[PDB]
Amino acid sequence: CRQEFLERVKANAAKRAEAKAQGVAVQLKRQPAQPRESRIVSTEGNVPQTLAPVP
Amino acid sequence: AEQVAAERAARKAANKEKRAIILERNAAYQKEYETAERNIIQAKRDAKAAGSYYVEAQHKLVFVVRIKGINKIPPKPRKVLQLLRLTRINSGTFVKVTKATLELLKLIEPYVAYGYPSYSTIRQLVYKRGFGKINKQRVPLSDNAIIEANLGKYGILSIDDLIHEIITVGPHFKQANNFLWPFKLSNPSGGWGVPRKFKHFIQGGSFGNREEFINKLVKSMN
Amino acid sequence: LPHPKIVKKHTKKFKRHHSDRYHRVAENWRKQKGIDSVVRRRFRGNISQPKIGYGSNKKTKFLSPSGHKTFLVANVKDLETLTMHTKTYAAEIAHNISAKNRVVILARAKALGIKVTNPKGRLAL
Amino acid sequence: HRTAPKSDNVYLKLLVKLYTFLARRTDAPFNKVVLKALFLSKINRPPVSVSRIARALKQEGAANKTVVVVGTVTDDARIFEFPKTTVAALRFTAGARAKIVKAGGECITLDQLAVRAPKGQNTLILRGPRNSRE
Amino acid sequence: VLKKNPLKNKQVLLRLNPYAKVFAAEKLGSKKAEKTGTKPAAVFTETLK
RNA sequence: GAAAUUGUUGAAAGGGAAGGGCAUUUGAUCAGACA
RNA sequence: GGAAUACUGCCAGCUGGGACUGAGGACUGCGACGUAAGUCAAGGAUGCUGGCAUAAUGGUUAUAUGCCGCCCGUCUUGAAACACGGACCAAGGAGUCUAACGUCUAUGCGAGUGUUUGGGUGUAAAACCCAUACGCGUAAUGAAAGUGAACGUAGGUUGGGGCCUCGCAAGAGGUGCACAAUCGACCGAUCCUGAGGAUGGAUUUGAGUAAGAGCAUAGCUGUUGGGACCCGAAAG
RNA sequence: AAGCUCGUAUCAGUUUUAUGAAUGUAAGAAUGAAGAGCUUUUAGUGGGCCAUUUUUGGUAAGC
């Protein structure tokens, strides 16, 4: 049930040691799944192929 | 007694200095918005010129307005509406979009009309229906010193810094949003458009995601 | 004395339910205690009840139309109390004061400039 | 939480009036506890015996402190020697008044204490045994 | 003592946001932009039709 | 010397109910301010 | 090829018409314009002007008109409904007094407390004084006989409002009230130790001691007994 | 209702992530709230009718 908590606290112990041993912006908190960032997707080989209920 | 005009004049000098800081910040935000939207336009044009497709960056901010009454609501969504501070009908709040918040929206779809706000709507919402939670006590904004006194802890020092933290969903979004008392909107000026309000927006109703027409909707509610 | 315009909220009298039907039921207000009364559950078209929403404006409460608080007075020594407060309070000569003494109080109130609400009381010629 | 005390004593009302002023002004946590204690009932303020004051002066580094009781100070027969300090309370039992004065110290009121310790400095507040009685 | 709305009543609009003077002066909402000639490619046009 | 209940006189209303609430016209009647 | 325009979105763009509202009452604040002085639409209405000065406001009232509006009370049940009471008016008409015990609050005194059984006195059922006892409490435990609560600064550890020292503050430490948990000392009955019942050993009991907290009066009130919230019963 | 603490990090008919054979835990995830705990005691209360969704049985059909 709490199998992840002890492991992530051990990861918090690894990231606290890494925090002290570096000029740090810490971020040990888990952030939820963000909205998707912008990307330019190219259609050079992979052509935008049409479909329809032909059927 | 002294101090009658001396401390007054020094206070006026401090007022002028603080105001000038706000001015150059506002100019910086104005230029930021303008260049941002120009970047979206030009990247779209360049994608078409390359024979490619440009996806936009997915929206990170929604405005949620309650559509239904307090009664005949299941508890599973009734708790959710209290958590989004949608206590009465037509009460509106801003929501940061994550995986955690999007499913909260999916539970309450038949009871709210939400979408993605522009800068113009947020500017008009905060300027007209702007109210702060100062210890409690729904305080009307009207003065920049009122914003700075509470939110100077988080950088924010004027009305437009607060709007900036809302739209450009920032490091201190939670504090600016929770500071803002849930907006109390009137029924829409032109009407709802639809005959029956409680169908999904796609099938000739009001509720659910409308994505962009929330700007048309909330500006009439404002 | 400068006062706001008086808004009463309810000009009418809150008469008791079925006071106009029966003669044994007085017009004096009583709350309908019964659980199946349509008056208690405030139905459409039933009589309006006294509730605290009908409370008069605090700045214009207890004031006569002239912006004066009425003050009952029996004799000269009690009238002499309103020497300083002439535009706040106005004298009211008590019902039981004789016609001999009312002329004394009226003349004295004219001298100090204290307003009497009821002259012509026992002043027949 | 209480606005006005259940007491009808005009002198207790004057002490309440005095400490409402000092509790809201001086912002010292002494006056807030004192003014809280004056709103309590008879069963809620049990008497402090002169024996407990004797203990509080045997206390380490608490010799020349001004002891404050917001109940009543009662006489005791079990003790034989009493120190030389100033005791502040509402009422003193005739015997305890006699004992404090005979030992050499002073027995003062609460307003007298309010002049001497407005911020409640060098003070010590004792309350009596509550759950000891039923 | 009373809530003066911005948007209307330009005086309280200038009380908040001191940039409002500069925004109105330069117009800055009715601001023109320079045009380019980035024509859409053959692939985009053919797949649109 | 109350009310129930009745007579007379004056006003008003009344096509298979009446009394009640909101609002006003109409008729009746009344309060100040101009001391 | 070179344009226009629709639609969509923005303007801290300008300019009209209409409605409802004017709360507050010397000055403070935030601002804007101005070269400055000063002004302002900036912390809620002022300026000008006219009719009347009484039934013209408005109220009360009888009616008309538009719209609304089951007959109250009781008793049932998940509801509605039945059913039962209600010809009309006046006056009368139902949680009262007391005893006993208890909670909370107020007051007096406080390891004490209570005068009012009585006596003295009295301006005379009032008030004002009081000797001797008595009641409850200050000690409990055991079936009774009986015995009877400090080894310690009245005890150690854990928290603990306050207060004290340092701290330009945050904070650290000392002291720790009431009170709460755990390990101990004494009283009581309960067995080995054998000094007969000794010094010491271990718990069980208690509404224990561990530096008292009660007594009395008054008020709100609860339980029980009284005719006991008012009227009614098949009677011996 | 009363007293004593902390007015707080005391939590929530909610989502997420992870652990699991629409329910179970944890969180230095989200979002929401200043009404939290502990004694003491003091009223009233101890029926159900209708409908929606799961699910097991049923039949001319209801159920």
CATH number for the domain harbouring residue D15: 3.100.10.10
Burial E7-45 (b: 16+ CB within 10 A, else e): eeeeebbebbbbbbeeeeeeeeeeeeeeeeeeeebebbe
Burial B3-22 (b: 16+ CB within 10 A, else e): eeeeeeeeeeeeeeeeeeeb
The experimental resolution of this structure, in angstroms, equals: 3.3
3-state secondary structure chain C: CCCCCCCCCCCCCCCCCCCCCCCCCCCCCCCCCCCCCCCCCCCCCCCCCCCHHHCCCHHHCCECCCCCEEEEECCHHHHHHHCCCCCCEEEEECCCCCHHHHHHHHHHHHHHCCCECCCCCCCCC
| Among B23, B50, B141, beta carbon nearest to E41 | B50
Check: CB of residue B157 under 8 Å from CB of residue B22: yes
CA triplet B24, B25, B29: central angle to 5 degrees?
115
The tokens describing B112, both together, are 């709210």
Q: What gap in Å lies between CA B98 and CA A32, rounded to an integer?
A: 6
A46: exposed, middle or buried (Cβ count in 10 Å: 0-12, 13-18, 19+): exposed
Check: CB of residue E14 under 8 Å from CB of residue B142: no
- In DSSP terms, A41 is beta-bridged to B53
Contact residues on chain B for E10, CB-CB shorter than 8 A: none
Q: What gap in Å lies between CA B136 and CA B56, rounded to an integer?
A: 39
Check: CB of residue B221 under 8 Å from CB of residue B186: yes
Which strand (E) or helix (H) includes residue A16?
helix A3-20
Q: Comparing C-alpha atoms, which of B107, B104, B108 is closest to residue B96? A: B104
Q: What gap in Å lies between CA B46 and CA C63, rounded to an integer?
A: 78
- For chain D, the first-to-last Cα distance in angstroms comes to 24
Q: Please state the φ and ψ torsions of residue D95, each to the nearest 5 degrees.
A: -70, -45
Q: What gap in Å lies between CA D12 and CA B211, rounded to an integer?
A: 67
Q: What gap in Å lies between CA A44 and CA D39, rounded to an integer?
A: 85
Map residue B13 onto helix, strand or coil: helix
Give how far E37 is from chain A: nearest CA, Å.
20
Nearest CA in chain A to E46: A48
For chain D, list the strands marked E by DSSP.
Answer: 48-49, 66-69, 72-74, 87-88, 91-92, 107-108, 123-126
Candidates B39, B59, B61, B97, partner chain A, best to mutate (most A CBs within 10 A): B97
DSSP state of B195: S
- Residue E31 corresponds to which amino acid? K
User: How many structural domains are present in chain D?
Assistant: 1
Residue in this structure with the two tokens 């990247």, named with its chain if needed: B43
Contact residues on chain A for B95, CB-CB shorter than 8 A: none
Q: What is the β-pairing status of strands D123-126 and D91-92?
A: unpaired
E38 in contact with A, Cβ within 8 Å: no
CB atoms within 10 A of CB C63: 19
Nearest CA in chain E to B31: E28
CA distances to B72, D4, D11, D115, D124 from D24, in Å: 48, 16, 20, 16, 20
D121: exposed, middle or buried (Cβ count in 10 Å: 0-12, 13-18, 19+): exposed
CB atoms within 10 A of CB D58: 10
DSSP for chain E?
-----SSSSHHHHHHS-TTHHHHHHS--SS--------PPPHHHHHHH-
Elucidated via: cryo-EM
Touch between C and B (at least 3 CB pairs under 8 Å): no
- Residue D107 corresponds to which amino acid? C
Q: Please state the φ and ψ torsions of residue C89, each to the nearest 5 degrees.
A: -105, 150
Torsion of Cα atoms, C20 then C22 then C28 then C29, to 10°: -80
Rg (CA), chain D: 15
Provide the domain limits for residue B91.
1-222
Provide the domain limits for residue D44.
1-132
Which strand (E) or helix (H) includes residue B139?
strand B136-140
Q: What gap in Å lies between CA D113 and CA D124, rounded to an integer?
A: 12
DSSP state of D73: E
Candidates E17, E23, E46, partner chain B, best to mutate (most B CBs within 10 A): E17
Look at the alpha carbons of A30, A35, A40, A41 in this order and tell me if their dihedral is positive or negative.
positive
User: How many structural domains are present in chain B?
Assistant: 1
Provide the domain limits for residue C9.
4-125
CA triplet A40, A43, A45: central angle to 5 degrees?
135
Rg (CA), chain A: 22
Contacts of A36 (CB under 8 A, 6+ apart): B55, B57, B58
Name chain A's partners: 3 or more CB pairs within 8 A: B, E
Q: What gap in Å lies between CA D105 and CA D100, rounded to an integer?
A: 6
User: How many structural domains are present in chain C?
Assistant: 1
The tokens describing B212, both together, are 């962009």
Residue in this structure with the two tokens 């996806």, named with its chain if needed: B55
Contacts of B190 (CB under 8 A, 6+ apart): B220
B49 in contact with A, Cβ within 8 Å: no
Q: What gap in Å lies between CA B150 and CA B55, rounded to an integer?
A: 39
Q: Which nucleotides of F are covered by protein (CB under 7 A)?
A: 3-5, 19-23, 31-33
